[PDB]
A paper describes a structure:
In humans, [name] proteins are represented by MiNT, localized inside the mitochondria, [name], and NAF-1, both anchored to the mitochondria outer membrane; with NAF-1 being also present on the surface of the endoplasmic reticulum and its mitochondria-associated membrane. [name] proteins harbor two [2Fe-2S] clusters with a unique 3Cys:1His coordination structure. Indeed, a growing amount of evidence demonstrate that [name] proteins play a significant role in Fe/Fe-S exchange between mitochondria and cytosol in cells. Here we report, for the first time, on a chemical compound, M1, that accelerates the dissociation of the [2Fe–2S] clusters of mNT and NAF-1 in a dose dependent manner.
M1-mNT structure determined by X-ray crystallography at 1.65 Å resolution shows the presence of an extra density that correspond to M1 molecule on each mNT monomer; monomer A and monomer B (respectively). According to the M1-mNT structure, M1 is in close proximity to the [2Fe–2S] cluster binding domain where the tetralin ring of M1 is oriented toward the [2Fe–2S] cluster while the distal phenyl ring is facing the β-cap domain. The M1 carboxyl group forms a salt bridge with Lys55 (2.2 Å distance between them) but it does not interact with His87 (3.5 and 3.7 Å distance). M1 is also oriented towards the side chain of Lys68 (β-cap domain of mNT) and forms a hydrogen bond with it (2.9 Å distance). Moreover, the surface of mNT and NAF-1 show hydrophobic residues facing the hydrophobic moieties of M1 (<4.5 Å) suggesting hydrophobic interactions between M1 and the mNT/NAF-1 protein. M1 binds strongly to the Lys55/Lys81 in mNT/NAF-1, respectively. In the native protein, hydrogen bond formation between Lys55/Lys81 and His87/His114 (mNT/NAF-1), is critical for cluster stability with His87/His114 in effect performing a gatekeeper function which is compromised upon M1 binding to Lys55/Lys81 to result in higher lability of the bound clusters. Previous studies indicated that Lys68 mutagenesis (insertion at this position) destabilizes mNT’s [2Fe–2S] clusters. Taken together the structures of M1-mNT/NAF-1 strongly suggest that in addition to His87/His114, interactions with Lys55/81 and cross-talk between the β-cap and the cluster binding area are also playing an important role in mNT and NAF-1 cluster lability/stability.
Numbering used by the authors:
A (entry chain B): 41 to 106
B (entry chain A): 42 to 107
The structure:
C-alpha cells in the first residue's frame, strides 16, 4: 500500500469516478477495475497482462441483463 | 510486488463479478481500488489510498435514470 494503482489515466482529475444509467447500457457492459485499459472505464483485457506480469488476480466488473 | 490487489480473495486467480441490472437498487457503487472491506462494493477506502499514494482512483456507479 505504497504504490499508485492508476499510473496514467486522467491524472488532472483528482478522483476518477464514472456513473452510468442502467437504462443506457446495452445487454452488457464490462468495466475495468485494473486501470490498465486503453478504453477506460471499459475493460479491454489489459488485466491479463497485468496479472501475468505482477502475479495479481484482478479482473473486470460485468453489468448485464438477466 | 507491483500488484493492485493486496488482500482480496487471493485463492481466486482472477476476480470477476457479474450482476444483473434487474437485481440492482436505485444506485450501486462498485469498488475500483481493491481496498474496500465490502468488495465488490465501495466503502470509501479509496480516499485513504489516494491520500497515502498520491493516486486518484474512485468508484463506478450504476444507477437508475432520473
Ligand atoms: O476479459 C474480458 N471479458 C470478460 S472476463 C469475464 C467475462 C465474464 C465471463 C463469464 C460470464 C458469464 C455470464 C455473463 C457474462 C460473463 C462475462 C467477460 C466478458 O463478458 O467480456 C475481455 C477480454 C478482452 C477484451 C474485452 C474483454
Ligand atoms: O456515491 C458515492 N460516492 C460518490 S458519488 C460522487 C463521488 C465523487 C465524484 C467525483 C469527485 C471529484 C472530486 C472530489 C469528490 C468527488 C466525489 C463519490 C465518491 O465516493 O467519491 C458512494 C460511495 C460509497 C457508498 C455509497 C455511495
Ligand atoms: S482491462 Fe482492466 S479489468 Fe480488464
Ligand atoms: S472503496 Fe474502492 S473505489 Fe471506493
Amino acid at each position: 500500500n505504497k504504490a499508485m494503482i492508476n499510473l496514467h489515466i486522467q491524472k488532472d482529475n483528482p478522483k476518477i469516478v464514472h456513473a452510468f444509467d442502467m437504462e443506457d447500457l446495452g445487454d452488457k457492459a464490462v468495466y475495468c477495475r485494473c486501470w490498465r485499459s486503453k478504453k477506460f472505464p471499459f475493460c479491454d483485457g489489459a488485466h491479463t497482462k497485468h496479472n501475468e506480469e505482477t502475479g495479481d488476480n484482478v479482473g473486470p466488473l460485468i453489468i448485464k441483463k438477466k
